[PDB]
Each structure stands twice: as structure tokens, then as C-alpha cells.
Enzyme design. Structure first.
Site, PDB file in Angstrom:
ATOM      1  CG  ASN A  81      -1.843  -1.265   1.196  1.00 31.32           C
ATOM      2  OD1 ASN A  81      -1.724  -2.103   2.088  1.00 31.32           O
ATOM      3  ND2 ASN A  81      -2.717  -1.396   0.209  1.00 31.32           N
ATOM      4  CB  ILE A  88       0.079   6.634   2.424  1.00 27.59           C
ATOM      5  CG1 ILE A  88       1.466   6.866   3.041  1.00 27.59           C
ATOM      6  CG2 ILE A  88      -0.786   5.756   3.324  1.00 27.59           C
ATOM      7  CD1 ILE A  88       1.468   7.628   4.367  1.00 27.59           C
ATOM      8  CB  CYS A  89      -2.924   3.043  -1.314  1.00 27.81           C
ATOM      9  SG  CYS A  89      -4.576   2.539  -1.866  1.00 27.81           S
ATOM     10  CG  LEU A  90      -5.077   5.087   5.460  1.00 28.10           C
ATOM     11  CD1 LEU A  90      -5.242   3.638   5.893  1.00 28.10           C
ATOM     12  CD2 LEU A  90      -4.239   5.840   6.484  1.00 28.10           C
ATOM     13  CG  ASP A 121      -7.160  -0.023  -2.514  1.00 26.76           C
ATOM     14  OD1 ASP A 121      -6.975   0.131  -3.737  1.00 26.76           O
ATOM     15  OD2 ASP A 121      -7.328   0.919  -1.705  1.00 26.76           O
TER      16      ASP A 121
END
Ligand code: ZN
Ligand code: ZN
Ligand code: ZN
Ligand code: ZN
Lengths: 151, 76, 79, 152
Positions: A81, A88-90, A121
Site C-alpha cells: 500500500n 500512501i494508499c489509505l 487495494d
């Protein structure tokens, strides 16, 4: 009035984060600019990131807290992520942001992301595929990157 | 009395309520705070993420009265 | 203190005159206990006991801030 | 049964408040063991035609209280356009303007205000209402007279 609203809270959060910082976290302004912050997350204990010190760049907007803050890694990490640059993929930093969320709650979510990654994801497909097919090799890659880049 | 200041604080500005109003789900915010959120297309509750309209706002006087009751005590 | 009687004021239900149990608001913003206001709401063309502004039974909202404070004041009454 | 405990609990609260902080020139409480059946003693308002009189009232609560109003009737004869020979009070809050937020104390203050300022608009005794507006001095003489005979 944009700037006074955002600055007034950021000031409130700076007081709370200093008093009651999140476990294994530290965050505050880089200098005179209240909108540009420098933080430090220690790798979660028990995780593959255990013993690493990871730095982050928190860039607030005058539209805070209605729009989320820009949170990017400097420090290289082996995470599905978190890509090469440090994006950052949050969910809460993109389309699932709420104005009730603080910077303290955003740091705890990053610590939970480091403890338990989301390969559903993925921002780095190769690392996500590895975490599910070959867990042991994924953990060996993540410990070598933590020792090399986070120490 | 720290826990009481807890209950009269607006989740959006984190300051004591100013014209406290409630939305469909029951959560309360400052009139100005929730109105700012109401100008962003699909308006959804900052606490529970339940969908809300501005037309359906209700005054929560009891809380505004409680903010004054706690301010009188803080003088001490 | 002497000044906590004014706070009990704010958490008292206008119909039963006891501290709110399951505090719910109606259209006008006035709050009551669910059971107290549902008794009013059953009786046909119902109106608000405080302001006489109409209200529908099906338009009730929990006022959780008040229920929390009821307990905050109950904890103090023990000491 | 749960109806009885709720009304009882509310009548109990009001019995404490009407004893602690009674309305001016009024007094009441239960006739006996029965918390639903009360009796009250009103003094004729100062300045009014009823000044110097002592009036009794019968308050009766129902297990549906406070959602339904109580029954309040006069037992002391009064010359008033809104109070008939059977002691029936024509007052909005005792009929279609009752509110469950109202207490028996607020009912009594309204009866004191009815005595001070009558409503010839809707009169239970048309005779007396006609007189109040046409021949006020003669109405007041009769009210002063009725007060001396029946309320002393
Ligand atoms: Zn607010
Ligand atoms: Zn909500
Ligand atoms: Zn109630
Ligand atoms: Zn109302």
C-alpha cells in the site's frame, strides 16, 4: 477566514499530539509554517518493520479539516500500500475522509496499515501477490528493507 | 468536569458548541460547522457517515444552555 | 456544589419531570423521553407540549449528548 | 397498572412542589389515602371583586395524567361568567389546550388569573358575560355581594 479556521485546529491538535501522542508516533511542525509538519513512526513491535524508524511529510491545506492532509513517506518501505516515491494508499487520506478525524487518528491508521497491510487495494501489485502466495519471502524482503533503509 | 466539557464539544471544530443543531442520525454540531460540510455535494455525517440534509436541522437548545452553565463554572 | 441543580434542569424531561430516559427530539428541537413523547404522539393530531408546534411520531431522533450527561450527573450524585 | 405508577410518580412530585412552592393565595393536597383525589383552597385575588373570599376546589387526577388534564371544579359559589352553578370552570388548559408539561400548580395560577380577568368571549354563564360588558359597575357590585355571602 479559510486560513484562521484551519490554523486554529491545527494549533489544537499540536497541543494534544504533544500531550498525548499516539503509541510509537511523534508529529510536529518543521518550522514557522504550521501547515508543513515532520513526523516519526517507529515500526510496530512484532511486525516485519520492528526496529525501523520511518519519517513522513504531513502537508495541511487551508481547507482542513474539510479536505484531508497530504501524508507521504520519505523513507523507503516494502509495503503493498506504499509505492517507490512514498504515496500512501489509505481510504481516509483519499475518498473516505471525515472532518471528525484528527492527525493523531491518521497516524494510528498508518500504524495499523504497517501491522496489517491490505492486498485487496494494492499500490504495488508485485508485493501484494507475494504477501498472499509466499508470506515467508514477503516477510524476508520487508525485514531486509527495514534494516537497510530504516536504521 | 473534563468529561462534561467532553459532551458539549463539537466534533468538527473541537470547541464548545455554537448554535448546536442535530442531523437525521441524531449527532449534533455547530450550525456553521455542519453547514460548511453541507456545501460539499453528497453531505454525510462526520461521526457515523449516515446521509444528511441541511433542511432537516433541529436546534439542540439543552446543549447551548449547558455550554453557558459550564462557562460560569470555569470563571472559578 | 450548589450550581449543579441548574444542570439537572437541562437534563429533565418536561412531561415526567425526571431525568431523560432515551432522550429523543421532535421537529421543533424540543427533547423528551421516548416513552413520554410516544404517549402524546399516539393521541391523534399531536402537538409539542412545550411550543405546541406539530410533530409526527415517525420523526424522532436520539439526543445521545443528553443521555451521556444524565449519567455524568448521576455519577456525581453518588459522592 | 404501569399507567398508575407513572401518574402516581408524577402526582407525588407535584405534591412535594405545591407544598414547597405553592402558588400565591392557593393551597391543595390529597383529601385522603387516594393520591388521585385532592382538595384546594383559593383566596379571592387582591384588588379583584373576589378580594376577601375563600373558595374551595375539587382536583381529580386520572391514571392517564399528565397526558390527560385533571378534573377541577368549584365547590364555593362564585359570580363569574366562566364558572357555572355546578362549579364547572371554562378554562382552555382544562379542555383542548391541555399540555402534559403543565402541573396542577400552573392550573391553579391560571384559575387565579381567570378570577382576576374573566373571559366574556366564551362565557359559561351568558347572563353574567353580557353584564360585565354592558353594566360593569353592577356586575362588580354583584360579584362583591356574592363573595361576601358565599365565600365568607
Ligand atoms: Zn463546530
Ligand atoms: Zn451521525
Ligand atoms: Zn419523560
Ligand atoms: Zn417544541
Amino acid at each position: 477566514k479559510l486560513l484562521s479556521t484551519s490554523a486554529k485546529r491545527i494549533q489544537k491538535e499540536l497541543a494534544d499530539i504533544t500531550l498525548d501522542p499516539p503509541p510509537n508516533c511523534s508529529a510536529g511542525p518543521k518550522g514557522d509554517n504550521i501547515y508543513e509538519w515532520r513526523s516519526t513512526i517507529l515500526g510496530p513491535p512484532g511486525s516485519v518493520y520492528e526496529g525501523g524508524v520511518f519519517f513522513l511529510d504531513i502537508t495541511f491545506t487551508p481547507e482542513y479539516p474539510f479536505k484531508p492532509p497530504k501524508v507521504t513517506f520519505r523513507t523507503r518501505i516494502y509495503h503493498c500500500n506504499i509505492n517507490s516515491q512514498g504515496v500512501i494508499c489509505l481510504d481516509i487520506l483519499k475518498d473516505n475522509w471525515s472532518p471528525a478525524l484528527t492527525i493523531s487518528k491518521v497516524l494510528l491508521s498508518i500504524c495499523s496499515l504497517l501491522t496489517d497491510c491490505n492486498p485487496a487495494d494494492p499500490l504495488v501489485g508485485s508485493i501484494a501477490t507475494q504477501y498472499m502466495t509466499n508470506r515467508a519471502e514477503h516477510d524476508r524482503m520487508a525485514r531486509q528493507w527495514t534494516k537497510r533503509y530504516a536504521t | 468536569l473534563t468529561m462534561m466539557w467532553e459532551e458539549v464539544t463539537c466534533p468538527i471544530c473541537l470547541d464548545p458548541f455554537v448554535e448546536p443543531v442535530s442531523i437525521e442520525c441524531g449527532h449534533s454540531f455547530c450550525q456553521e460547522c455542519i453547514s460548511q460540510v453541507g456545501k460539499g455535494g453528497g453531505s454525510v455525517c462526520p461521526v457515523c457517515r449516515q446521509r444528511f440534509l441541511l433542511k432537516n436541522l433541529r436546534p439542540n437548545r439543552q446543549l447551548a444552555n449547558m455550554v453557558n452553565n459550564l462557562k460560569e463554572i470555569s470563571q472559578e
